[PDB]
A = this chain, B = another copy of it.
Amino acid sequence: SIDVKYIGVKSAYVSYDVQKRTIYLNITNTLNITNNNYYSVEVENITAQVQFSKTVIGKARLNNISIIGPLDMKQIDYTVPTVIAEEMSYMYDFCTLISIKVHNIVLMMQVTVTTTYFGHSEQISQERYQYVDCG
């Protein structure tokens, strides 16, 4: 919710970036920085009454007050059928980041069959870092 960032290279408060055939000569840098951060975040005052039946008095008849179902759920159920007579594959790979017929799956399930939940529920997913470097 606050300060969520994807940054391709670099993050700073003060940054000096001096490069590529440069003269940086006789310089006076003076910084008087005040940068206080005050966070009052997700401060919750919750008064909750949760009843299916609160009061029954006398010969009353109650049936099937809350029904959740039937429930039939399927997720990440794909199919990749391959029927081939003859394959030739020639692969020449030099200095390459390569993935071939790979299956990458992330499933995060947090509050899934609950009657009641009070408070804070959080999911964070930060995906893979992959690289190839050649001289």
A52 touches B27 (CB 8 A): no
Q: Number of contacting residues on A, CB 8 A? A: 135
Q: Which of B31, B62, B133 contacts A63 (CB 8 A)?
A: B62
Q: A70-B71, A86-B87 are in contact. Are A18 and B21 (CB under 8 A)?
A: no
Instruction: Quickly give the copy total for this chain.
Output: 3
A2 touches B128 (CB 8 A): no
Residues in B neighbouring A132, C-beta threshold 8 A: 95-97, 131-133
B15 touches A16 (CB 8 A): yes
Residues in B neighbouring A50, C-beta threshold 8 A: 48-51, 115-116
B9 touches A12 (CB 8 A): no
Q: Which residues of A contact B (CB under 8 A)?
A: 1-135
Mind listing 16 A-B residue pairs with CB under 8 Å? A5-B6, A14-B31, A24-B27, A38-B39, A46-B118, A50-B50, A53-B54, A58-B59, A60-B62, A80-B103, A85-B86, A100-B100, A110-B111, A118-B119, A127-B127, A127-B129
